[PDB]
Every structure is written in C-alpha cells, then in structure tokens.
Design a protein around this ligand. Structure first.
Ligand SMILES: OC[C@H]1O[C@H](O)[C@H](O)[C@@H](O)[C@@H]1O
Ligand code: NA
Ligand code: NA
Length: 149
C-alpha cells in the first residue's frame, strides 16, 4: 500500500527505502531526493577509512533517523548499490554507532566515481570495534536502495 505519510520527492529520487516499513510515498516504498535527505538534518562523521587518504569529513543523514522516518518494523536492512553490491546490516548498528548515509565528502557532493551519491559511513576511528571488516562490509558505497526485513 501507499500510506502517503511522506511527501513525494520534487527532484530525482536517489534513495528508495522499501520492505517491512510503515511510512511511504510510493507503493510499499519511501522515495527520497537529495533535498529531502538534507532536510532531515546533516550530521558529521570525521574519520580515516580503508579507502581514503588521511582523516576525511563526511556529512550526511542519520540512518537511525531514516529508519524512524519510514517506521521500520524489521531488525535487518539490505543495502543495494548502483554497482550491484548487496549488504545486510542489522538496524541496531545505526543506534549503537553514529552511522550516517553520507552525502558530502570534505564539503563536496560525492560523484558515482567518488563512491556516491550515498555511502553508509561508520565512525571507524571512534572505537576499535568499528576498525574491522564486519563494519567495512556494512559500509555500502553508491547506495540506491534500503530493503527492510
Ligand atoms: O581507517 C580505518 C581504521 O584503520 C586502522 O585500523 C586504524 O588503526 C584505525 O584508527 C582506523 O579507524
Ligand atoms: Na509492502
Ligand atoms: Na555482513
């Protein structure tokens, strides 16, 4: 069903959240353009990563907030990337850690060649627990879809 409890996007959708959710703006899905994501509030994560040179600044939307916006009912979300990557992420990670869906890198929007437009980012250098392949594997870049189960 389409609850119609989230506004329809005015620009091109860059993220579709679907599955075991409550709040939608399409059949069984919540479509978001970049303006809608920025409007939810931008959070900052500064960290080194396995893929970047030195400490970089990511700005993006809290994934815990996105799960609350769509009324996620499940405990698992599958990220699907533009490049075909599929990554299952326990939703509890988003709360425990400041995980963000990054939109900007060092103050600039990320192109597809820069792992954008959306990139799941954990604050790796904030806790030795996060400096592990478990969380690097959950850090899906070029995210297009989040399927809640
Ligand atoms: O760049 C990701 C991680 O790489 C290494 O494990 C560093 O020791 C750690 O501080 C950092 O968070
Ligand atoms: Na549905
Ligand atoms: Na995994």
């Amino acid at each position: 069903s389409n609850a119609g409890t989230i506004a329809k996007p005015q620009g091109k959708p860059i993220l579709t959240i679907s599955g075991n959710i409550t709040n939608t703006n399409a059949e069984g899905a919540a479509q978001f353009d970049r303006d809608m994501l920025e409007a939810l509030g931008m959070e900052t994560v500064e960290t080194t990563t396995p893929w970047h040179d030195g400490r970089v600044r990511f700005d993006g939307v809290s994934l815990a907030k996105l799960m609350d916006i769509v009324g996620a009912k499940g405990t698992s979300v599958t990220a699907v990337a533009l490049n075909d990557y599929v990554s299952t992420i326990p939703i509890e990670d988003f709360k425990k850690f400041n995980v963000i869906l990054a939109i900007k890198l060092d103050g600039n929007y990320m192109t597809v060649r820069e792992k954008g437009p959306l990139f799941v980012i954990y604050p790796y250098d904030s806790d030795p627990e996060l400096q592990k392949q478990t969380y690097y594997s959950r850090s899906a870049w070029q995210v297009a879809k989040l399927i809640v189960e």
